[PDB]
């Protein structure tokens, strides 16, 4: 809670995970689940560098990541797809259109990409939103909760700082803050649909699911 907004933004920028490389339907979802497993390991490293997160107990860290992991994967996928209208950039070597899709989720992901592009979402705003997803999505499921809300308030201050620096009026700042946070409702929705699809894949025992992903499903 001591960082400046600018130090907050630079801390989150430096913590960004790398972009990794990756057709039957058994084969495509093999690629997606294999990619998701590898991205999840890098996610853990990023989570440990989100300010405030290391202050939490290991069990609170586990709960928050178990709740938010697919939302975090999903907003990360939307963000790197933003400059590829109509397509999802799963990896630099896995750029997919909707006919290749799953389709219900694909369309929701494309709609979010389109919304981000219409708002001209900035990378500094994106890393704030990703950190909010991590701290918020499991907070509703006592000194520890107050710490998480104090950190969440700091990230809101940071988002507002960025829009002020960008020259937005107060009214525009508040409107854009609201537009950004409302998208998180849609990301929650997509993650719930993606989780339920991943449970169906687990049940039919065809797609190779890593131990790690399997326990993320168990947690849901």
């Amino acid at each position: 809670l001591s960082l400046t907004a600018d130090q907050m933004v630079s801390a989150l920028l430096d913590a960004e995970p790398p972009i990794l490389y990756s057709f039957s339907e058994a084969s495509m979802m093999g690629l997606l689940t294999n990619l998701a497993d590898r991205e999840l390991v890098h996610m853990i490293n990023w989570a440990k560098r989100v300010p405030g997160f290391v202050d939490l107990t290991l069990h609170d860290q586990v709960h928050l990541l178990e709740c938010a992991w697919l939302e975090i994967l999903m907003i990360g996928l939307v963000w790197r797809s933003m400059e590829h209208p109509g397509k999802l950039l799963f990896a630099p070597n896995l750029l997919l259109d909707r006919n290749q899709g799953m389709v219900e989720i694909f369309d929701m992901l494309l709609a979010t990409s389109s919304r981000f592009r219409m708002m001209n979402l900035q990378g500094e705003e994106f890393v704030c939103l990703k950190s909010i997803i991590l701290l918020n999505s499991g907070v509703y499921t006592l000194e520890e909760k107050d710490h998480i809300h104090r950190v969440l308030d700091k990230i809101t201050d940071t988002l507002i700082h960025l829009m002020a620096k960008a020259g937005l009026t107060l009214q525009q700042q508040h409107q854009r803050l609201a537009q950004l946070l409302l998208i998180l409702s849609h990301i929650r929705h997509m993650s719930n649909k993606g989780m339920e699809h991943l449970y169906s894949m687990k049940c039919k025992n065809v797609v190779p699911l890593s131990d790690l992903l399997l326990e993320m499903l168990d947690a849901h």
Binding site: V41, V62, L65, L212, E215
Partner: peptide
């Protein structure tokens, strides 16, 4: 579990 070991 695994996530514990990874953090």
């Amino acid at each position: 579990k695994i996530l514990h070991r990874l953090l």
